[PDB]
């Protein structure tokens, strides 16, 4: 079916990545994106990444505000701009 509008995905539509797919945190561990836009407890521009390995910090869940719910501490939020679009390593390269 493709969907899922919360509202905020004019950042990552901007960037060139959906929810779901997974992304690559400081070019090292990966974690699946959940959520994209903006923040409550912080302030402007956000995303929720679950970890895959078994680490974490939060449960996707920050006070009165839930972003997923993910097993004891597999929650992990940063900037989009402290991210990189992993899978598919092939492609433009120079150098």
Known sequence: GSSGSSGGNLM?????LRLGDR???????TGTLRFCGTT???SGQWVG??????????DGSV???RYFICPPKQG??????????AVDAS?????
């Open 49 to 58: 990444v679950e970890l895959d390995e078994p680490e974490g910090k939060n």
């Open 91 to 95: 492609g433009p390269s120079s150098g």
């Open 76 to 85: 992990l939020f940063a900037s989009v701009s402290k991210i990189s679009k």
């Open 63 to 65: 006070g009165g505000v």
């Open 12 to 16: 990552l539509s901007a960037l060139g």
């Open 23 to 29: 992304v690559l945190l400081d070019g090292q561990k």
């Open 40 to 42: 409550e407890f912080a």
